[PDB]
Design a protein around this nucleic acid. Structure first.
Length: 76
DNA sequence: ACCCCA
């Protein structure tokens, strides 16, 4: 029933997930219940690790993709 | 674009 899932993301996408002052990722952690770790520093690729029961992981993933979708094509 | 918490 508990898993660890790792997402490989570009830095621009991590900016969208984390949000201003971390307000987005703090919301995703609190609402999903997943433990969510994001690798540090402005590297071209970043790793997001989701841990928890599979329903916590699924909700965190849904939130993350919904945030990326809202922010698609938003910076150039 | 957003940079969290460890």
């Amino acid at each position: 029933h508990m898993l660890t899932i790792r997402l490989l993301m570009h830095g621009k996408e991590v900016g969208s997930i984390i949000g201003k002052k971390g307000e987005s990722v703090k919301r995703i952690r609190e609402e999903s219940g997943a433990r969510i770790n994001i690798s540090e520093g402005n590297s071209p690729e970043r790793i997001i690790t989701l841990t928890g029961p599979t329903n916590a992981i699924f909700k965190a993933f849904a939130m993350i993709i919904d945030k990326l979708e809202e922010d698609i094509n938003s910076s150039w």
